[PDB]
Amino acid sequence: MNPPPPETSNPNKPKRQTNQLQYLLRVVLKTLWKHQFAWPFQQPVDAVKLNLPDYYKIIKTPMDMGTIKKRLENNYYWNAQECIQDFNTMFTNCYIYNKPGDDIVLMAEALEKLFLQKINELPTE
Ligand SMILES: Cc1cc(-c2nc3ccccc3n2C[C@@H]2CCCN(C(=O)C3CCN(C(C)C)CC3)C2)cn(C)c1=O
């Protein structure tokens, strides 16, 4: 079976808008979301549909851009570094689970290069 997806809203976790979090939604997520190579990252890994019974045996902190998009839109975060952490967890999980030579690793590497370019211009608080 699949685990429940990561939460994108929590009534007990303080949240706010920062111009940095607005930049992460309007520029960073926006740019990555409709990249040609975005689609494997737009939702949680469905280990049932893909027949990957070991995925959630290996990956215990799953993350995906669908979850991050909802967290940004739902105002889940307190600061930009929490969101940048989620992006990096998504990339790290991909590189840990998958093998060099896998199409998904090339796809992640293209998205990560673009991610790092956009994060490099995170605005002043
Ligand atoms: C393992 C995995 C799968 C997916 C995924 N989300 C999908 C949504 C819709 C339809 C298909 C989807 N897939 C399948 C991948 C899509 C890109 C290309 N893929 C590969 O390169 C294989 C190569 C072989 N490897 C090995 C480790 C079994 C597994 C990956 C196959 C996403 N993420 C983040 C993953 O880490």
Numbering used by the authors: 43 to 167
From the paper:
Each protein contains tandem N-terminal bromodomains, termed BD1 (closer to the N-terminus) and BD2 (closer to the C-terminus), making a total of eight bromodomains in the BET family.
As with benzimidazole 14, the pyridone group of 31 acted as the KAc mimetic, making the predicted hydrogen-bonding interactions directly to Asn140 and through water to Tyr97. The benzimidazole core occupies the ZA channel formed between Trp81 and Leu92, with the latter amino acid making a 3.8 Å CH-π interaction with the imidazole centroid. Demonstrating the design hypothesis, the basic piperidine (pKa: 9.6) interacts with Asp144 via a 3.0 Å salt bridge. Presumably, this clash between 31 and His433 contributes to the high levels of BD1 domain selectivity through the reduction of BD2 domain affinity. Interestingly, comparing the location of Asp144 between the BRD4 BD1 apo structure and that bound to 31 shows that only a slight 0.6 Å shift occurs to make this interaction with 31. X-ray crystallography analysis was used to guide the medicinal chemistry design strategy to target a conserved Asp/His switch to drive BD1 domain selectivity via a salt-bridge interaction, with metadynamics simulation and WaterMap analysis used to understand the observed SAR. These efforts resulted in chemical probe 31 bearing a basic piperidine, which makes a direct salt bridge with Asp144 and clashes with His433, driving high levels of BD1 domain selectivity (300–1000-fold depending on protein and assay format) across the BET bromodomain family.
